[PDB]
Amino acid sequence: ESADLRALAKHLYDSYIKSFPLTKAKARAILTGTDKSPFVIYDMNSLMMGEDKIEVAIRIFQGCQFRSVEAVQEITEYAKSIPGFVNLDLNDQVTLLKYGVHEIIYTMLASLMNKDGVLISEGQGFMTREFLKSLRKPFGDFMEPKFEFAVKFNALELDDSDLAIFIAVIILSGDRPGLLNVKPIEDIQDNLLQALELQLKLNHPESSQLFAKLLQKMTDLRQIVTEHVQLLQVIKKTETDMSLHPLLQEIYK
Numbered sequence: 001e002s003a004d005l006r007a008l009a010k011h012l013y014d015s016y017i018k019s020f021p022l023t024k025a026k027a028r029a030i031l032t033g034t035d036k037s038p039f040v041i042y043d044m045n046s047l048m049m050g051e052d053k054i055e056v057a058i059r060i061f062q063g064c065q066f067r068s069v070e071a072v073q074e075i076t077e078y079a080k081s082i083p084g085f086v087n088l089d090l091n092d093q094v095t096l097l098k099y100g101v102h103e104i105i106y107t108m109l110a111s112l113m114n115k116d117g118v119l120i121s122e123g124q125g126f127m128t129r130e131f132l133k134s135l136r137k138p139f140g141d142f143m144e145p146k147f148e149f150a151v152k153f154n155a156l157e158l159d160d161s162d163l164a165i166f167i168a169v170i171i172l173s174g175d176r177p178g179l180l181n182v183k184p185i186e187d188i189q190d191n192l193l194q195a196l197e198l199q200l201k202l203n204h205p206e207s208s209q210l211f212a213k214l215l216q217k218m219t220d221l222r223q224i225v226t227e228h229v230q231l232l233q234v235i236k237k238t239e240t241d242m243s244l245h246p247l248l249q250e251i252y253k
Protein backbone atom coordinates (compact mmCIF):
# COMPACT_ATOMS: atom_id res chain seq x y z
CA GLU A 1 0.00 0.00 0.00
CA SER A 2 1.30 3.40 -1.06
CA ALA A 3 1.07 4.92 2.44
CA ASP A 4 3.59 2.35 3.76
CA LEU A 5 5.87 3.00 0.76
CA ARG A 6 5.78 6.75 1.45
CA ALA A 7 6.77 6.25 5.10
CA LEU A 8 9.65 3.99 4.04
CA ALA A 9 10.84 6.66 1.57
CA LYS A 10 10.68 9.18 4.44
CA HIS A 11 12.66 6.85 6.73
CA LEU A 12 15.52 6.30 4.29
CA TYR A 13 15.78 9.99 3.37
CA ASP A 14 15.92 10.85 7.07
CA SER A 15 18.77 8.34 7.64
CA TYR A 16 20.60 9.43 4.50
CA ILE A 17 20.65 13.02 5.80
CA LYS A 18 22.01 11.70 9.10
CA SER A 19 24.75 9.49 7.58
CA PHE A 20 26.08 11.62 4.67
CA PRO A 21 27.37 15.09 5.65
CA LEU A 22 27.75 16.36 2.07
CA THR A 23 24.42 16.00 0.31
CA LYS A 24 23.78 16.65 -3.38
CA ALA A 25 21.59 19.64 -2.47
CA LYS A 26 24.54 21.17 -0.63
CA ALA A 27 27.00 20.15 -3.37
CA ARG A 28 24.83 21.90 -5.97
CA ALA A 29 24.50 25.08 -3.92
CA ILE A 30 28.31 25.22 -3.77
CA LEU A 31 28.73 24.42 -7.53
CA THR A 32 26.14 26.96 -8.74
CA GLY A 33 27.10 29.94 -6.60
CA THR A 34 27.95 33.22 -3.11
CA ASP A 35 28.07 32.26 0.62
CA LYS A 36 31.08 29.85 0.70
CA SER A 37 32.61 29.33 -2.76
CA PRO A 38 35.32 26.66 -3.13
CA PHE A 39 39.00 27.20 -3.72
CA VAL A 40 39.82 25.90 -7.19
CA ILE A 41 42.76 23.56 -7.82
CA TYR A 42 43.66 23.50 -11.52
CA ASP A 43 47.49 23.10 -11.65
CA MET A 44 50.39 22.13 -9.38
CA ASN A 45 51.03 25.35 -7.47
CA SER A 46 47.33 26.05 -6.94
CA LEU A 47 47.29 22.60 -5.33
CA MET A 48 50.13 23.83 -3.11
CA MET A 49 48.13 26.96 -2.26
CA GLY A 50 45.42 24.46 -1.32
CA GLU A 51 46.36 24.12 2.30
CA ASP A 52 47.26 27.74 2.94
CA LYS A 53 43.44 27.98 2.30
CA ILE A 54 41.85 24.57 3.13
CA GLU A 55 54.82 13.73 -5.69
CA VAL A 56 51.58 15.45 -6.67
CA ALA A 57 49.93 12.35 -8.19
CA ILE A 58 50.66 10.24 -5.10
CA ARG A 59 49.28 13.14 -2.96
CA ILE A 60 45.97 13.11 -4.85
CA PHE A 61 45.91 9.30 -4.68
CA GLN A 62 46.22 9.15 -0.90
CA GLY A 63 43.68 11.99 -0.68
CA CYS A 64 41.07 9.96 -2.55
CA GLN A 65 42.08 6.91 -0.49
CA PHE A 66 41.27 8.75 2.74
CA ARG A 67 37.92 9.98 1.43
CA SER A 68 36.88 6.49 0.26
CA VAL A 69 37.56 5.01 3.71
CA GLU A 70 35.43 7.82 5.08
CA ALA A 71 32.73 7.10 2.48
CA VAL A 72 32.72 3.39 3.35
CA GLN A 73 32.18 4.33 6.99
CA GLU A 74 29.26 6.62 6.13
CA ILE A 75 27.80 4.01 3.78
CA THR A 76 28.16 1.29 6.42
CA GLU A 77 26.30 3.52 8.86
CA TYR A 78 23.50 4.09 6.34
CA ALA A 79 23.22 0.34 5.62
CA LYS A 80 22.26 -0.48 9.21
CA SER A 81 19.28 1.83 8.95
CA ILE A 82 17.72 -0.06 6.00
CA PRO A 83 14.95 -2.12 7.62
CA GLY A 84 15.89 -5.81 7.63
CA PHE A 85 19.57 -5.34 6.86
CA VAL A 86 20.97 -5.93 10.34
CA ASN A 87 18.73 -9.00 10.75
CA LEU A 88 20.35 -10.71 7.76
CA ASP A 89 23.06 -13.34 8.26
CA LEU A 90 26.33 -11.60 9.36
CA ASN A 91 28.28 -13.07 6.36
CA ASP A 92 25.59 -11.72 4.01
CA GLN A 93 25.71 -8.25 5.60
CA VAL A 94 29.46 -8.25 5.02
CA THR A 95 28.97 -9.51 1.45
CA LEU A 96 26.36 -6.88 0.59
CA LEU A 97 28.69 -4.12 1.80
CA LYS A 98 31.86 -5.51 0.21
CA TYR A 99 30.22 -5.44 -3.23
CA GLY A 100 27.83 -2.51 -2.82
CA VAL A 101 30.17 0.06 -1.45
CA HIS A 102 31.99 1.24 -4.55
CA GLU A 103 28.83 1.37 -6.69
CA ILE A 104 27.36 3.70 -4.07
CA ILE A 105 30.59 5.69 -3.95
CA TYR A 106 30.48 6.39 -7.71
CA THR A 107 26.76 7.19 -7.54
CA MET A 108 27.26 9.81 -4.84
CA LEU A 109 30.52 11.04 -6.36
CA ALA A 110 28.39 12.19 -9.29
CA SER A 111 26.56 14.48 -6.84
CA LEU A 112 29.83 16.39 -6.38
CA MET A 113 30.65 16.63 -10.12
CA ASN A 114 29.85 18.85 -13.05
CA LYS A 115 31.38 18.42 -16.50
CA ASP A 116 34.39 20.53 -15.40
CA GLY A 117 35.44 18.99 -12.08
CA VAL A 118 34.72 17.63 -8.62
CA LEU A 119 34.19 19.05 -5.14
CA ILE A 120 36.73 17.92 -2.53
CA SER A 121 37.45 18.44 1.18
CA GLU A 122 33.78 18.60 2.18
CA GLY A 123 33.08 21.10 -0.60
CA GLN A 124 35.80 23.52 0.56
CA GLY A 125 37.75 22.89 -2.65
CA PHE A 126 37.12 22.12 -6.32
CA MET A 127 39.54 20.08 -8.45
CA THR A 128 39.27 20.49 -12.22
CA ARG A 129 38.73 17.56 -14.58
CA GLU A 130 41.55 18.62 -16.94
CA PHE A 131 44.04 18.81 -14.04
CA LEU A 132 43.14 15.28 -12.90
CA LYS A 133 43.54 14.07 -16.49
CA SER A 134 47.03 15.62 -16.82
CA LEU A 135 48.43 13.40 -14.05
CA ARG A 136 51.44 11.11 -14.83
CA LYS A 137 51.36 7.46 -16.08
CA PRO A 138 48.39 5.58 -14.61
CA PHE A 139 47.12 8.19 -12.08
CA GLY A 140 45.70 10.49 -14.77
CA ASP A 141 43.04 7.93 -15.89
CA PHE A 142 41.47 7.18 -12.57
CA MET A 143 38.84 9.94 -12.50
CA GLU A 144 37.94 10.44 -16.16
CA PRO A 145 35.43 7.54 -16.49
CA LYS A 146 33.64 8.66 -13.30
CA PHE A 147 33.33 12.15 -14.83
CA GLU A 148 31.85 10.42 -17.88
CA PHE A 149 29.34 8.50 -15.76
CA ALA A 150 28.46 11.54 -13.64
CA VAL A 151 27.68 13.79 -16.62
CA LYS A 152 25.15 11.22 -17.84
CA PHE A 153 23.85 10.17 -14.41
CA ASN A 154 23.32 13.82 -13.39
CA ALA A 155 21.19 14.14 -16.55
CA LEU A 156 18.53 12.18 -14.64
CA GLU A 157 18.19 15.16 -12.23
CA LEU A 158 17.80 13.02 -9.11
CA ASP A 159 17.67 14.64 -5.71
CA ASP A 160 18.81 13.31 -2.35
CA SER A 161 15.42 11.80 -1.47
CA ASP A 162 15.64 9.84 -4.73
CA LEU A 163 19.24 8.79 -4.13
CA ALA A 164 18.52 7.53 -0.60
CA ILE A 165 16.19 4.83 -1.99
CA PHE A 166 18.31 3.98 -5.02
CA ILE A 167 21.41 3.54 -2.85
CA ALA A 168 19.41 1.17 -0.65
CA VAL A 169 18.33 -0.76 -3.74
CA ILE A 170 22.02 -1.13 -4.68
CA ILE A 171 23.02 -2.53 -1.23
CA LEU A 172 20.29 -5.17 -1.06
CA SER A 173 21.16 -6.75 -4.37
CA GLY A 174 21.09 -10.51 -3.91
CA ASP A 175 23.10 -11.48 -6.99
CA ARG A 176 26.30 -10.62 -5.18
CA PRO A 177 28.74 -13.55 -5.20
CA GLY A 178 28.85 -15.73 -2.11
CA LEU A 179 25.46 -14.91 -0.59
CA LEU A 180 24.08 -17.55 1.78
CA ASN A 181 20.35 -16.61 1.99
CA VAL A 182 19.56 -14.83 -1.26
CA LYS A 183 15.79 -14.86 -0.71
CA PRO A 184 15.34 -12.58 2.37
CA ILE A 185 17.65 -10.08 0.63
CA GLU A 186 15.43 -10.18 -2.46
CA ASP A 187 12.30 -9.62 -0.37
CA ILE A 188 13.77 -6.43 1.05
CA GLN A 189 15.03 -5.15 -2.32
CA ASP A 190 11.58 -5.83 -3.74
CA ASN A 191 9.97 -3.51 -1.19
CA LEU A 192 12.73 -0.93 -1.79
CA LEU A 193 12.07 -1.07 -5.55
CA GLN A 194 8.40 -0.53 -4.82
CA ALA A 195 9.40 2.44 -2.70
CA LEU A 196 11.75 3.75 -5.42
CA GLU A 197 9.11 3.39 -8.13
CA LEU A 198 6.47 5.32 -6.20
CA GLN A 199 9.06 7.90 -5.13
CA LEU A 200 10.11 8.57 -8.71
CA LYS A 201 6.58 8.90 -10.07
CA LEU A 202 5.55 11.34 -7.32
CA ASN A 203 8.77 13.40 -7.26
CA HIS A 204 9.20 13.50 -11.08
CA PRO A 205 5.77 13.14 -12.73
CA GLU A 206 6.94 14.56 -16.08
CA SER A 207 9.92 12.18 -16.26
CA SER A 208 8.82 9.19 -18.31
CA GLN A 209 10.40 5.85 -17.31
CA LEU A 210 12.93 7.45 -14.93
CA PHE A 211 12.60 4.25 -12.87
CA ALA A 212 13.64 2.11 -15.82
CA LYS A 213 16.39 4.58 -16.82
CA LEU A 214 17.73 4.64 -13.25
CA LEU A 215 17.96 0.82 -13.06
CA GLN A 216 19.75 0.63 -16.42
CA LYS A 217 22.39 2.92 -14.81
CA MET A 218 23.36 -0.02 -12.62
CA THR A 219 25.34 -1.54 -15.48
CA ASP A 220 27.30 1.69 -15.87
CA LEU A 221 28.32 1.36 -12.20
CA ARG A 222 29.45 -2.25 -12.44
CA GLN A 223 31.82 -1.32 -15.27
CA ILE A 224 33.52 1.60 -13.46
CA VAL A 225 34.28 -0.77 -10.59
CA THR A 226 36.06 -3.18 -12.95
CA GLU A 227 38.22 -0.53 -14.66
CA HIS A 228 39.08 0.84 -11.24
CA VAL A 229 40.24 -2.51 -9.81
CA GLN A 230 42.51 -2.93 -12.83
CA LEU A 231 44.06 0.52 -12.40
CA LEU A 232 44.53 -0.18 -8.68
CA GLN A 233 46.43 -3.36 -9.61
CA VAL A 234 48.81 -1.52 -11.96
CA ILE A 235 49.73 0.79 -9.09
CA LYS A 236 50.18 -1.95 -6.43
CA LYS A 237 53.04 -3.26 -8.61
CA THR A 238 54.49 0.09 -9.86
CA GLU A 239 54.93 1.76 -6.41
CA THR A 240 55.60 -1.12 -4.06
CA ASP A 241 56.25 1.53 -1.33
CA MET A 242 52.61 2.66 -1.20
CA SER A 243 49.85 0.95 0.75
CA LEU A 244 46.12 0.50 0.29
CA HIS A 245 44.28 1.17 3.57
CA PRO A 246 43.18 -2.18 5.07
CA LEU A 247 39.45 -1.41 5.00
CA LEU A 248 39.88 -0.85 1.25
CA GLN A 249 41.88 -3.91 0.22
CA GLU A 250 39.64 -6.09 2.39
CA ILE A 251 36.80 -4.84 0.16
CA TYR A 252 38.94 -5.62 -2.93
CA LYS A 253 39.15 -9.51 -3.34
Ligand SMILES: CN(CCOc1ccc(C[C@H](Nc2ccccc2C(=O)c2ccccc2)C(=O)O)cc1)c1ccccn1
Nearest residue numbers: 060061062063064065067068119120121122139142143248
Ligand atom coordinates in the same frame (compact mmCIF):
# COMPACT_ATOMS: atom_id res chain seq x y z
C1 LIG B 1 35.11 14.06 -1.92
N1 LIG B 1 36.32 13.69 -2.64
C2 LIG B 1 36.20 12.98 -3.90
C3 LIG B 1 36.22 11.46 -3.72
O1 LIG B 1 36.65 10.92 -4.94
C4 LIG B 1 36.76 9.52 -5.02
C5 LIG B 1 37.04 8.91 -6.24
C6 LIG B 1 37.16 7.52 -6.33
C7 LIG B 1 36.99 6.75 -5.19
C8 LIG B 1 37.13 5.22 -5.23
C9 LIG B 1 38.38 4.83 -4.43
N2 LIG B 1 39.55 4.99 -5.27
C10 LIG B 1 40.88 5.21 -4.71
C11 LIG B 1 41.28 4.52 -3.58
C12 LIG B 1 42.54 4.73 -3.05
C13 LIG B 1 43.39 5.64 -3.66
C14 LIG B 1 42.98 6.32 -4.80
C15 LIG B 1 41.72 6.11 -5.33
C16 LIG B 1 41.20 6.83 -6.59
O2 LIG B 1 40.06 7.57 -6.27
C17 LIG B 1 42.17 7.73 -7.38
C18 LIG B 1 43.43 7.30 -7.77
C19 LIG B 1 44.25 8.16 -8.49
C20 LIG B 1 43.82 9.44 -8.84
C21 LIG B 1 42.56 9.86 -8.46
C22 LIG B 1 41.74 9.01 -7.74
C23 LIG B 1 38.35 3.39 -3.90
O3 LIG B 1 38.65 2.41 -4.65
O4 LIG B 1 38.06 3.17 -2.70
C24 LIG B 1 36.71 7.37 -3.98
C25 LIG B 1 36.59 8.75 -3.88
C26 LIG B 1 37.65 14.02 -2.14
C27 LIG B 1 37.77 14.64 -0.91
C28 LIG B 1 39.05 14.94 -0.45
C29 LIG B 1 40.15 14.61 -1.25
C30 LIG B 1 39.94 13.99 -2.47
N3 LIG B 1 38.71 13.72 -2.88
